[PDB]
Design a protein around this ligand. Sequence first.
Ligand code: MG
Ligand code: MG
Ligand code: MG
Ligand code: MG
Ligand code: MG
Ligand code: MG
Ligand code: MG
Ligand code: MG
Ligand code: MG
Ligand code: MG
Ligand code: MG
Lengths: 63, 67, 106, 141, 206, 143, 58, 145, 70
Amino acid sequence: TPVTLAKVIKVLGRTGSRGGVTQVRVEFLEDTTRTIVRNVKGPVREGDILVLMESEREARRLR
Amino acid sequence: GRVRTKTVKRASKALIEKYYPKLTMDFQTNKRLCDEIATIQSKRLRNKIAGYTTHLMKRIQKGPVRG
Amino acid sequence: QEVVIHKIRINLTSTKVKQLENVSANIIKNAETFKLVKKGPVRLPTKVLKISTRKTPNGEGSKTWDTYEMRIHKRYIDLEAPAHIVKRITQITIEPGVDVEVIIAA
Amino acid sequence: TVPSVQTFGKKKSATAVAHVKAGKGLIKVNGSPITLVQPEILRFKVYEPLLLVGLDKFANIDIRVKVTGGGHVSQVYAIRQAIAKGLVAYHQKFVDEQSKNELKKAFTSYDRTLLIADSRRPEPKKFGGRGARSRFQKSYR
Amino acid sequence: FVPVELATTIPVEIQQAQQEIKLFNKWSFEDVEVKDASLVDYIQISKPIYVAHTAGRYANKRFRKAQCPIVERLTNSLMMNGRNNGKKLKAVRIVKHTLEIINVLTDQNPLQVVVDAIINSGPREDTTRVGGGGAARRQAVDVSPLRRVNQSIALLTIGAREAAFRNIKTIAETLAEELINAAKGSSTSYAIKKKDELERVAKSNR
Amino acid sequence: PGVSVRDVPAQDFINNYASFLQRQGKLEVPGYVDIVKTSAGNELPPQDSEGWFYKRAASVARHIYLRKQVGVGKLNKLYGGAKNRGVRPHKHVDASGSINRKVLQSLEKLGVVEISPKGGRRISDNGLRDLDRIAAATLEDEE
Amino acid sequence: AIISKKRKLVADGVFYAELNEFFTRELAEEGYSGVEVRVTPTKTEIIIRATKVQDVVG
Amino acid sequence: SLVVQEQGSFQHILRLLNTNVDGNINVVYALTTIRGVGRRYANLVCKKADVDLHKRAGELTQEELERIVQIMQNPTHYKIPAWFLNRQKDVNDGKDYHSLANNLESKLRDDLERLKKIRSHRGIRHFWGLRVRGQHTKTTGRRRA
Amino acid sequence: AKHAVVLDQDKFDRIMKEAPTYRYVSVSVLVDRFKLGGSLARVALRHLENEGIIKPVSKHSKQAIYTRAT
RNA sequence: UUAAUUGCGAUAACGAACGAGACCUUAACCUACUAAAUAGGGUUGCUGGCACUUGCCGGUUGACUCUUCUUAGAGGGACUAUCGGUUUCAAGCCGAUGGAAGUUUGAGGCAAUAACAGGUCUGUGAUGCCCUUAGACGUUCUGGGCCGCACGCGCGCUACACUGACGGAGCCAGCGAGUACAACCUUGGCCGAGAGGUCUGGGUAAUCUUGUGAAACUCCGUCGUGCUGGGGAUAGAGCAUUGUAAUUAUUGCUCUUCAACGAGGAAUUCCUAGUAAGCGCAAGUCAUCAGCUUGCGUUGAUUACGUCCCUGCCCUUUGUACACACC
Ligand SMILES: [Mg+2]
Ligand SMILES: [Mg+2]
Ligand SMILES: [Mg+2]
Ligand SMILES: [Mg+2]
Ligand SMILES: [Mg+2]
Ligand SMILES: [Mg+2]
Ligand SMILES: [Mg+2]
Ligand SMILES: [Mg+2]
Ligand SMILES: [Mg+2]
Ligand SMILES: [Mg+2]
Ligand SMILES: [Mg+2]
């Protein structure tokens, strides 16, 4: 199973229809300086390492 | 939620206006000074005022502030 | 000619603490002026008297409850003394609100 | 005449007076020694401060604890706290201060309270609630 | 090496397992390193503890909960259900038993096994309920390390509790089995199955 | 050095006491043994029928040794606990009143327990010696 | 005479309250306000405040 | 302490006092399966017989069983205080009566009949099919007998 | 009742045979292998615990763990 | 931004007040002060038990001094402090360090403006009016009843097991409250299997009940996933106890009978730390009764540390033919 290990540079807002998600711009561990925004479920700070299968897909502010 | 109230801030401002000298940056001395000069019917309130004055002093080192 | 040591307890009970404290201080000062061996203004577990009640006269609202409390201050002042000196002391040494009480004898 | 301190240990309502004198190496709690205690699992907790600085700092200092308040767990914790304090106090008083500082460092890098006393006490269980916050049951039915 | 004695007598074994090494309940806290990238620090180890019980306040700010020992966390999770509310002692005992069982099982560091279990059962990407009008459509989302860890911790315990109802297999044994299943990823334990299901759900929305 | 008495891990001491009692044969059995609930919060007596009362006695003696002026009421309180009250929640009701008294009497007869002033019971000197011996034996068993 | 200290104090308070109520009722024309009880050995002083002191005196 | 061996000296699955005594149960709590036979009472009986509390219910010597039966019949003949009984000082006969097996039910029925005859409040309630011990049924138990 | 909590000689013999070369010697484990009850298992263990063979790891009540001699 | 009309800034407003805050009581810190044969701890008398050597462990109000713990008194103490960046380097918020204590330090107490035709005339010698009034709705005795059951709903408690169960055995609080003119809290000792009684007390109370030796919890054995030893429900029998009075068990314990219930459908309640939940105790009641309330400890976590999606409110902008205001 191919896994792409993400890493936080900045938190780009708490979101969701309710509150259980967070827009986060990420520079993943290997092959750095590529910024992709992903929505994250749990509590996240700065330099947090994130486990994900599907890397190169962007999700917006949820309705 | 530790936003200092109007009253405390006002008092601090007044103190700074009237006694800009004798406010030696650090808390402890400043607190005592506040207790001496300003008449506060409390202790906690006085402390708060002292803290705010110290903050103001710190600010006023790094430029001029409005009011 | 007398001077026979009895050892006398003084009770100081009240509510308004400041007054009580003042009285205690006064007593100690008086003891000092008559110069006697004495144990201090010994303080006991300041008994609170709690009465908790429905705030509602009639039981039709939310269940609001109030604890009406009575702070009490019990003080022992022990004297190594005869009785005459104690009597002399207790001629004055009375201030409003505070209870002055002499237990007398060891 | 002996070099000795009287230390307190404090958690919840448990209080523990450990007396730190000088002698062979006796560490007792309520007459019985340091070994027993008997929540059984929490035994190793009381062993922790001792372990941290070693058995060497006990062949000189004797510790004797009297514990009131609390329950079992709390009592254990209080004892632990007391023991931690006692050694430190002794070092501060009679032994060199470098040793004391080292002890402090060891404790602070492993701060399971100890030299810092426990903070929390219960909120008062106010009216309209079976617990402190926890209310009864509103029933708009 | 070197048993220094006192007036109050301590058993020999205890003396042996003391000063030389910064140990655990009886064995090595040392070694035991995280095989997986990420989740390090957020799966504790690092700071040596000698028991799986602290008064240590952690539910104070936010990211402090991810500095609480793994064994301790397990014990805490075990305290679930009303019959088991509070009773940390019991939980600690259970954890000890589990550790012993793991030790018995083909040697190895039990702590390491536990860590592996925690890693394996943690779901990667999960669906959250998105509004978008009225219908309960779900859009899959990346899960932060801490949350993942928490979920993993929960899941094993839940599985154990499920097992423990009407069984000679006392909870500890069940927990150990679950851990083993997680570590040797065979998808036979509850936790792993649940994780798989979640992943499937995510896929059906990705 | 010094042979200690309090330093025994509880249960072992009690067991030793029981064994000693069994060996001696001198106690005088209450008679209402086994035909009793022992505690007011009991549905079953002691499980092992014969013995266990001996253990209880030993425990009582140990408690006496530990403390100062100790009485029947306190003993009852000690050996009470939680009542299975069915639909109603537990309370705290004490142990059987006479049994403890009988035990105390038996102890007095043997010479373990002595009558104290002010109101209660303490330890006899021969009794103390016996206790010490028991402790020593326990230590030997451990060492 | 003599009860538990707490109890005694409570009783005294109650007495004071009763007295106050009585004065409100009885001295209505007298323009009464407050009672100031002073309990010493033998002589218990009871101070009473009013607007129309003359009426109270008689 | 030791496992009971031998090929088959003692027979499994018993039938004692008009009813059934199932094996694989240690002494006492298979005798509770007997209608009316006690826990404490059972223990006392066992003690009187002189049996260890380590045996199985699917064992027991015949002599022992006989002894047990004898103990069951009369509480007075053996060292039993006998105020642990269904009928102590009694409602009619005035002796010591702890009924056994399929007889307790009969006794109960007889008592009920007597009550009915007398026409006491309790009896009336029984007739109705309701609640004896002043228990109220404004809310609880909405199916009943 | 689910049986297999009897006595017998054959069962004892089987137990005797099922002792060397095993990772676990636990009460729960024994129960799982469709053998004697919880208390009986302990007794059986004790009978084999005379000259080596089976050695303890934990001594706790209802959570006992034993292992073979190495 | 804030818990906040809390503040900063923008700005025909400026400076104000009430409310929020502040304040107040309590809970936390003081090895610095004030003192304690009513809280404690030490050294030595007398001796008790040892190892048998000096040393331990004690008890004993003997003497002496201290005050850490206990208690209060007086103060002090945290002011988001110290940097780290963020945000106009405003207001502030987050992270580390120190610190007893960095969620308004926790918990309240108090609580504006106007109200609602909200609740009580059953708390009243608080009450306008109407009613009734002496073969009375005034009174008082005797008895029942407010506790009935075909069945609705809402508080709760106990259970549905091996995180057990029962014995043992270990053994730990904190609030409390408690009589002389009476029928209190009641130790301690003999008799009773319990329930209890009795002779002596001690306490108009840190001193006695009381270390309230509470439960939950911790060790060993016995039974091991059976409507079973889980569960103790419908029930008979004695002895007690309360009160003139217990049947419609007041309650109590003992033997028995030993049922419904194998984790609860639709809905939804409560909760963000000593918090939830567990587990008792005490008081309120009270002649007698606790499953209830107030309180207090005792164990003691999960997961947020957000957002308006649902629910409720709030303000703005909008429209209104309503203003007894959408019933
Ligand atoms: Mg139960
Ligand atoms: Mg910032
Ligand atoms: Mg506040
Ligand atoms: Mg109305
Ligand atoms: Mg009227
Ligand atoms: Mg009614
Ligand atoms: Mg209600
Ligand atoms: Mg007390
Ligand atoms: Mg049954
Ligand atoms: Mg009620
Ligand atoms: Mg228009």
